[PDB]
Amino acid sequence: MRITFNDVKTSLGITESYDIVNAIRNSQGDNFKSYVPLATANNVAEVGAGILINQTVQNDFITSLVDRIGLVVIRQVSLNNPLKKFKKGQIPLGRTIEEIYTDITKEKQYDAEEAEQKVFEREMPNVKTLFHERNRQGFYHQTIQDDSLKTAFVSWGNFESFVSSIINAIYNSAEVDEYEYMKLLVDNYYSKGLFTTVKIDEPTSSTGALTEFVKKMRATARKLTLPQGSRDWNSMAVRTRSYMEDLHLIIDADLEAELDVDVLAKAFNMNRTDFLGNVTVIDGFASTGLEAVLVDKDWFMVYDNLHKMETVRNPRGLYWNYYYHVWQTLSVSRFANAVAFVSGDVPAVTQVIVSPNIAAVKQGGQQQFTAYVRATNAKDHKVVWSVEGGSTGTAITGDGLLSVSGNEDNQLTVKATVDIGTEDKPKLVVGEAVVSIRP
Amino acid sequence: MRITFNDVKTSLGITESYDIVNAIRNSQGDNFKSYVPLATANNVAEVGAGILINQTVQNDFITSLVDRIGLVVIRQVSLNNPLKKFKKGQIPLGRTIEEI
Amino acid sequence: TAFVSWGNFESFVSSIINAIYNSAEVDEYEYMKLLVDNYYSKGLFTTVKI
Amino acid sequence: MRITFNDVKTSLGITESYDIVNAIRNFKSYVPLATANNVAEVGAGILINQTVQNDFITSLVDRIGLVVIRQVSLNNPLKKFKKGQIPLGRTIEEIYTDITKEKQYDAEEAEQKVFEREMPNVKTLFHERNRQGFYHQTIQDDSLKTAFVSWGNFESFVSSIINAIYNSAEVDEYEYMKLLVDNYYSKGLFTTVKIDEPTSSTGALTEFVKKMRATARKLTLPQGSRDWNSMAVRTRSYMEDLHLIIDADLEAELDVDVLAKAFNMNRTDFLGNVTVIDGFASTGLEAVLVDKDWFMVYDNLHKMETVRNPRGLYWNYYYHVWQTLSVSRFANAVAFVSGDVPAVTQVIVSPNIAAVKQGGQQQFTAYVRATNAKDHKVVWSVEGGSTGTAITGDGLLSVSGNEDNQLTVKATVDIGTEDKPKLVVGEAVVSIRPN
Amino acid sequence: YTDITKEKQYDAEEAEQKVFEREMPNVKTLFHERNRQGFYHQTIQDDSLK
Incomplete structure (x- = not known):
């Protein structure tokens, strides 16, 4: 903090477009003739945008005196994350979370004659x-020199307000970072190819394409909320069911504005041609083809493990250091439905899921x-099975x-593969499952 | 009798699309620029989807079950059929129904 | 011995029972749909072409 | 060394959990006072905020560690040499009265002198x-958050935070004692006995045992020997007060019995009078036999002090121990060396310091410590310088x-030859006062 | 398990530079x-209960 700034113009980062002063002066029947009768249109033009650096200016009447600052204003801001409503509870102690799901079983035929020797036979769930x-695991660090900051203020209220704003900046930064971390999850899930993909043409090309997308979304939601369930919308391929009140659709502002300008402001009975579940609007996804994401409330599995603040004081330098430590768990559940609604180029098969992924068996x-193939078309793709454990x-x-x-004792890997490429251009999608054996 | 899982990676149930980590790495003012200020993003993206099994201290009978369980969540679902309104009652005795 | 609490064990047992009941519900739904499919397969429906 | 909750439970007047810290202390209206099976509530109350967390951890570690380590370091096997705090006004000076005979009763001789003094x-x-040194250790926040799951985790945490410091300190005590013995031997105030490599053969072992027995019985003579000790003082000591510091390999070679039979103890009371170290590392020293009061240690202070790193989320607690170690000049001490030591170890002038007038x-x-059976001549010189x-x-x-300079009486004995690069010199200081 | 080490000499000149240092892993x-895990098992007759 040293005040040495001489000969600084009020044109630092300004690149004027047409030089309003000359535009006003050389006006003969132009649109700028309105400003011609203004007495002082040059000082206003040159000062009205504000100045980054001020200099001491003498008084008009008595040049010995100096003009002084009449008002000081401190701006405040508070930023939140609209995804905070998706956060789960809190886990103070612990590092990991375990999720267990039980699936349905198979039906047998009643046979009393065969039932007299299979009473104690067992069938594992x-x-x-x-x-x-x-x-x-992160933290935010700030410093405050309260004693050295007292020369820049005249009012204790303004000093306290400035310190309060400095403190609130940390919370604003934490909120922004939390929003970014939470929104990265959907992009990561799409990049891993775990969403269920529905192909759409374009939400912006035409009203017909927009209404086709609306129709597809409504059909998908109806299929999701069926009483009997379906193992077609979760990456674990389990027979699960969802409720309408727990379905969230995340879209962007451009799509929302196009929808409510085109299909809602021109349709009678607007409730028959709009979105079904809860609607959330964000600032777009980072993925190329992502348009709208339809997820279940239980899809998000984010928890907070630590949120604390620690302060230390330097007696020699007379300043306070503030550290804000935040620790969190960020993940999503594969047992819940999740639809991607992609509009670009989508491959024929997105993934292959082998229902038993880990299994322990005896020597013999x-x-x-x-195997379940997630095909984005109505075509049927054959599956080739193989095992490579290195045993004969x-x-x-x-x-x-x-x-x-x-005879042998080693781990085994089971592969179920499909060929989605053309002849001489083999493109392979592989689903892997590992098998352990007990001796 | 001893069973264990080793030499297994957390990518068997993964079909990589565009390698989000590499996409973040080679970003020049693109749509991925929003994640740059995040100090620890690689660790988050590593277990963003969730691990089916890992290499830690684990139990024997059930799959994995890391010793530091911390929190266990068990989720149940109820499946119903929509045609149950078409069902009639019960026939405790007899076999055949005659319709005239 | 897998879990450290009685609540987790009872939840697991209840989950198994619920799985049995869900399997029964799914099977009866499929049987009632098979009734309609079989009726159509035997040609006893009155057909209207669209 | 294998300290568990039992040692702290018997050191403190407590049973299982306690609320001493929060009772002493605001802090009280943050944590419950229940000493019942509830641990989650007290953990939450302790970890509710950083101020309470720091206060609790600081009070706990400081007070409990100091008390427990002080009460458990005084029950070590080498506690009989361990005295309390250093006494006030010790004057760091040793005074001892030499034993002598008795004067015959004689009225005629007594009537001449009745105010005569006896002896300096x-x-x-x-x-x-x-x-003076410190040990210090660090504790993380993770294994403090994960320590209130059950009441046993808290006691395991306490044992873990005490055991490291206690083990290091009790290990280092033996090293300091060995270094003190080495320094004393290097100064050469011991009286020496020559042996011949007791582990070389089996006859050397029994010869060494016989030498130890003879030396002990000579030390414990009721009448007095005057042959031992750093100066001829003619003292005596009990057989139950002798302590033996022996090398580890020699101790392993020797058997538990017969070594105890050389004294009057029988194994159970003898194993408490023997100290085993891993090599003296001083020329050819094998085993040192000293009196009980020869070696003492006074604890200046023990302190525990903690600091916290808010940037790193951990604590550091430093344990400082300062103490002084003293060896007496009037106690019996025998070196028992096996090497090529000289014939004459030291020459001692009995009067030591003297104050005399001008006329x-x-x-x-002069007493000569000879390791052989031969005799040696002693020459006297005045040094000083006068007429x-x-x-x-x-x-x-x-x-x-008419003399004022302080003079020094010097006694010299030589065990050399035509070339004599060796002289054993004993010095006495005489101060002259004007009459 | 925590290892046993010799103490550090007391010296304020070197102590003033490092007070937040850890010690060791x-x-x-x-x-x-x-x-x-196993079992033994046995049988008992009604005769040698009567």
Whole structure:
């Protein structure tokens, strides 16, 4: 803090377009003739945008005196994140979160004669497990020199207001960072190819395309909220069900404005041609083809583990250091429905899911695996099964039944692949599942 | 009898589209510029989707179950059928119904 | 021994029971749909062309 | 060394959990006072905010660590050499009265002198050695948040934060004792006995045991020996007060018995009088046999002080221990070396410091610590510098008048040859006063 | 497990430069485990209960 700034013009970062002063002066029947009768239109023109640096100016009457500052104003701002309503509870102690899902079973036929030797036969349930771990640890650092900051203020109220604004800046930064972190999750999920993809033409090309997108969204929501459920909209391929009141559609402002200008302001019975679930508007996604994302309330699995503030004082320098530490867990659940609604170029098959992903079997035994292909078209894609564990005597039938030999003891990997490319241009989509064996 | 899972990566249930980490890395004023101020984004993107299984201290009978469980959530769903209004009552005794 | 609380164990057992009941519901829905499909397959419906 | 909750529970007048910290302390209206099975509530109350967290952790570590470590470091096996705080006005000076015979009863001789004094108390100065250091350790916030899950986690945390410091300190005590013994031997105030590599063969072992037994029985003579100790003082000591510091390999080679039979103890009371170290690392020293009161230690202070890093989310607690170690000059101490030590170890002048007038005389006697059975001659010199002040061959020095410089009586014994790059010199200081 | 080390000499001149320093890692390791589970079982007759 040293006041040495001499000969600074009030034109630092300004690149004028047409020099309003000359435009007004050389006006003969132009649009600027309105400003001709103004007595002082040059000082206003040259000062009305504000000046970044001020200099001491003497008084008009007595040049010994200096003009002084009459008013000082301090601006305040408060920023929030509209996704905060998606946050889950709090986990003070712990690092990981465990998620368990149980699936439906199969029906057998009643046979009393065969029931007299299979009373104690057992049939294990179908259970799937998912894990999440804490993945964000950060802090914000600020310093305040209260004693050295007293020469710039005349009123204790203004001094306190400035200090309060400095403190609030940390919270604003934390809110912005939290919003960015939460919005990165959808882009990461789309980049991993775990969304269920619905192909649309374009939300902006034509009103017909926009209304086709609306129709597709309504059909998808109706299919999602069915009492019997469906294993077609979750990455784990489990028979699950969703409720209409828990469905959230995230779109952007351009799409919202185009929709309510084109299809809502010109349609009678507007309730039959609009969105169904809860509607959220953000500032667009980072993905190329993403237009609108339809998710379940339980899709978000974000938790906060630490939120604390610590202050230290320097006696030699007379200043306070403030540290704001934030620790969080950011992840999403694969047991909930999630639709992407892509409008660009989409491959024929997005992923292949093998229903048993981890399984432990004995030295000699058979295990059945099922595969689901997420195709974006109505075409049927065949699935090729293989196992590569490096052991001789184990083999997988084309139906996905793997029989393991007891001669060797090592981990096995099971692959179900499809070919979505053309001849001489093999494009492969592979779904992997690992098998352990007990000796 | 001992069972364990090793030499397994958390990408078997992943079909990479555009490698969001690399996209963030090679960004020049694009739509991905909003994530630059984030100090720790790679760690978040690593386990953004969720890990099916990891390599830590784990139990034996059930799959994985890291020792530091911290919090366990179990979710239940109820499935119903929409045609149940068309069902009639019960026949405790007898086999055949005659309609005249 | 898998869980450290009785609530988790009872929730797991209740989840298994709920899975059984959901399987029964799905099966009866599929059977009632199979009734209609079989009736159509036997040609006993009155057909209208669209 | 394997400290668990039992040691702290018996050191403090408590049973299981306690609310001493929050009772002493605002702090009270943050944490519940219940000592019941509830641990989540007290954990939340402690961790509600950083001020309460810091206050609780600081009070806990400081007070509890100081009290527990002070009460558990005084029960170590080497506690009989451990005294309390240093006494006020110790004057760092040793005074001892030499034993002598009894004067025969005689009225005729007594009537001439009744105000006569008896003897100077051969004062000397303590041999001191100061020690001061710190250990310090760090504790994270993670393994304080994850310590209120159950009441046993809290006690495990306390044991963990005490055990490291206690182990390091008790390990370092032995090293300091070994260094003090090495320094004393290097100064050479020990009286030496020559042995021949007791681990070289089996006959050397029994010869060494016999030498130890003979030396101990000579030390514990009821009448007095005067042959031992850093100066001829003619003291005696009990057999139950002798302590043996022996090398680890020699101790392993020797058996538990017969070594105890050399004394009057029987194993159970003998293992408390033997200290084992991993090598003396001083020439050919094997085992040192000293009196109980030969070595003492006074604890100047013990302190615990903590600081917190808000940028790193952790604490550092430093434990400072300062104490002084003293060895007496009037106690019995035998070196028991095996090497090529000289025939004569040290020559000691009995009168030591003296104060004489300008026309007086003084008698000095010299004691030579010889490791062999031969005899050696001692020569006397006056040093100083004056006229008429001289010492005869028998140690009688007469001072002539009109003298002011302080003189030093010097006794020299030589065990050399035609070339003599070796002299054993003992010095006495005589101060002259004007009559 | 925490290791045992010799103390640092007391010196304010060197102490004034580092007061927030840690000491050492605590050489953590994982336990060597082996679990067992079995049964013995026996029978009892009604005769040697009567």
